[PDB]
Amino acid sequence: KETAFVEVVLFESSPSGDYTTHTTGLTGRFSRAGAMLSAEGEIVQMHPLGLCNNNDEEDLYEYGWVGVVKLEQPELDPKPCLTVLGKAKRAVQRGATAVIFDVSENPEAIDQLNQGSEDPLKRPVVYVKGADAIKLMNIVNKQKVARARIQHL
Amino acid sequence: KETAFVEVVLFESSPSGDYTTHTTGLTGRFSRAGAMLSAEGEIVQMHPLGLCNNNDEEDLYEYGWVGVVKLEQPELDPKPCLTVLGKAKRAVQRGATAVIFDVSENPEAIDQLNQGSEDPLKRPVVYVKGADAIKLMNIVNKQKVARARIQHL
């Protein structure tokens, strides 16, 4: 639906106490399964098979993380553990302040999500594609310790 | 100037992996020294004498914290280390994603801040008073580990 401006911040401390930052802006869109809210947190890269309640608890994630999930070619998962819409549920259920899906290689996700007017989540679910997704992932993949800032309207 | 809706979240983990939350909403206003942006982070209680470059570096704060400063009666600080407007600068300079001043006992702060159209900060500066400030502080003081969510418009 409405636009989801997203900033990604890489940050190093300097000896002089102060932080340095690089920062990259992405456009994204807000799903109807999520709340159309601003939100901000440390980015966590969730494995699409890593958001599975097949396993009870994975590791510790401190409350308030931005969960980023790079979606797979649907063809390559016939037998999943969780819906696109119930993966979001669990991350949120587990501290995520926002969820971000790179649906580049699975655009049907959009609909499943955007036809989610049955019990939507308190926290935002955002999807990205195109050149906007390329960046994110090139940042998440290559990076480690990065903070996302998702703004609404 | 414009309103700054602020949520304060207390959060505990449950054995079952999931978080529980209590949450309290405050109204605040956005200073002209800050950016009128949404922002979110772990709340840190900065001492008004604790935001002093009299001391070079204090302790480690991970980038992205919401700095909360409860302002003193001006009468009780004739000889300060930093302006209201340069205290904000340093927190921001040191990772703060937002700054929050309880100006209850020092409303002049407002002006000093709101007459800050000379080189304003990338990150938001919010002030609160009244029943809105009472809450925050009653939460910060009594609490430990709490997350703030500041929304614009």
Curated annotation (Swiss-Prot), chains A, B:
It is found in: Cell membrane. Disruption phenotype: Embryos die around birth due to activation of Wnt signaling pathway. Embryos display a lack of lens formation due to Wnt activation. Conditional knockout mice lacking both Rnf43 and Znrf3 in intestine show a marked expansion of the proliferative compartment, resembling the effects of acute deletion of Apc. Residues 1-153 are extracellular. E3 ubiquitin-protein ligase that acts as a negative regulator of the Wnt signaling pathway by mediating the ubiquitination and subsequent degradation of Wnt receptor complex components Frizzled and LRP6. Acts on both canonical and non-canonical Wnt signaling pathway. Acts as a tumor suppressor in the intestinal stem cell zone by inhibiting the Wnt signaling pathway, thereby restricting the size of the intestinal stem cell zone. Along with RSPO2 and RNF43, constitutes a master switch that governs limb specification. Belongs to the ZNRF3 family. Interacts with LRP6, FZD4, FZD5, FZD6 and FZD8. Interacts with RSPO1; interaction promotes indirect interaction with LGR4 and membrane clearance of ZNRF3. Interacts with LMBR1L. This is E3 ubiquitin-protein ligase ZNRF3. It comes from Mus musculus (Mouse). The gene is Znrf3.
